[PDB]
């Protein structure tokens, strides 16, 4: 797996792979 710099859509491109489309919340802050 690659250690990489990622903002928004790129960060979700790791998130979506790491969570394997099972599910996640990419929101930067809760409130």
């Amino acid at each position: 797996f690659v250690k990489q710099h990622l903002c928004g859509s790129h960060l979700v491109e790791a998130l979506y792979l790491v969570c394997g489309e099972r599910g996640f919340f990419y929101t930067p802050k809760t409130r």
Binding site: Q4, L11, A14, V18, C19, G23, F24, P28, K29
Partner: peptide, 22 residues
């Protein structure tokens, strides 16, 4: 937020698997 770490520095499953809800 994790974005503040991942967009400025470097991330992998070791950081991102904290976002998953499932």
């Amino acid at each position: 937020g994790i974005v503040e770490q991942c967009c400025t520095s470097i991330c992998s499953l070791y950081q991102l698997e904290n976002y998953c809800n499932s």
